[PDB]
Design an enzyme around this catalytic site. Structure first.
Site, mmCIF file in Angstrom:
data_model
loop_
_atom_site.group_PDB
_atom_site.id
_atom_site.type_symbol
_atom_site.label_atom_id
_atom_site.label_comp_id
_atom_site.label_asym_id
_atom_site.label_seq_id
_atom_site.Cartn_x
_atom_site.Cartn_y
_atom_site.Cartn_z
ATOM 1 N N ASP A 1 -14.374 8.884 -7.584
ATOM 2 C CA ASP A 1 -15.248 9.213 -6.468
ATOM 3 C C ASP A 1 -14.746 10.372 -5.620
ATOM 4 O OD1 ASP A 1 -13.196 7.592 -5.177
ATOM 5 O OD2 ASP A 1 -14.622 7.117 -3.589
ATOM 6 N N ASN B 1 -8.268 9.451 -5.869
ATOM 7 C CA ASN B 1 -9.152 8.664 -6.725
ATOM 8 C C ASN B 1 -10.117 9.606 -7.389
ATOM 9 O OD1 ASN B 1 -8.229 6.002 -5.765
ATOM 10 N ND2 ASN B 1 -9.079 6.755 -3.819
ATOM 11 N N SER C 1 -12.164 10.768 -3.726
ATOM 12 C CA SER C 1 -11.642 10.490 -2.394
ATOM 13 C C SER C 1 -10.121 10.339 -2.441
ATOM 14 C CB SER C 1 -12.265 9.210 -1.851
ATOM 15 O OG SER C 1 -11.920 8.102 -2.666
ATOM 16 N N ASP D 1 -6.693 8.175 -0.475
ATOM 17 C CA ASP D 1 -6.236 7.125 0.435
ATOM 18 C C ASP D 1 -5.076 7.703 1.193
ATOM 19 O OD1 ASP D 1 -8.054 5.376 -0.756
ATOM 20 O OD2 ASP D 1 -6.616 4.845 -2.306
ATOM 21 N N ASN E 1 -9.056 5.089 2.884
ATOM 22 C CA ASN E 1 -9.873 5.975 2.055
ATOM 23 C C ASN E 1 -10.715 7.017 2.819
ATOM 24 O OD1 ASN E 1 -12.625 6.238 0.271
ATOM 25 N ND2 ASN E 1 -10.801 6.176 -0.997
ATOM 26 N N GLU F 1 0.798 -1.220 0.000
ATOM 27 C CA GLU F 1 0.000 0.000 0.000
ATOM 28 C C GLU F 1 0.835 1.276 0.000
ATOM 29 O OE1 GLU F 1 -2.841 0.223 -0.890
ATOM 30 O OE2 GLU F 1 -4.144 -1.323 -0.074
#
Length: 130
Positions: free
Chosen positions: A49, A46, A51, A53, A60, A35
């Protein structure tokens, strides 16, 4: 901060992550490795949408933390996404425990499924004495 392999293992272990909800330390390690590379300041936007992370576990902003700029956001972890970019990972761990408390478990993270699930992940902790 970018943790070193065994430095992270020992820490996640003292924070009660080993075996948390049937999830071994090596699995938490494998998730963090893919990650963020063990970097608490990792981030990923992202566009679809709107958002982002955050952190070592890439939590998220749409469901887990509040960053103030994500549409239809929930704050299930009840914390500022900002707290997930800190050197002290105590908050990131607590929020990671909450994520895996949902029915999907660690499978919530696509990276874990593609890179860790069903694979030998023993390399992540061998030599750390954990």
């Amino acid at each position: 901060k970018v943790f070193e392999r065994c430095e992270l293992a020992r820490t996640l272990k003292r924070l009660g992550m080993d075996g948390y909800r049937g999830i071994s330390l090596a699995n938490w390690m494998c998730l963090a490795k893919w990650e963020s590379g063990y970097n608490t300041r990792a981030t990923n936007y992202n566009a679809g949408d709107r958002s982002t992370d955050y952190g070592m576990f890439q939590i998220n902003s749409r469901y887990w933390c509040n960053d103030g700029k994500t549409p239809g956001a929930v704050n299930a972890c009840h914390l500022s996404c900002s707290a997930l970019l800190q050197d002290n990972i105590a908050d990131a761990v607590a929020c990671a425990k909450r994520v895996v408390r949902d029915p999907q478990g660690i499978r919530a993270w696509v990276a874990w499924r593609n890179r860790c699930q069903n694979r030998d992940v023993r390399q992540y902790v061998q030599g750390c004495g954990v």
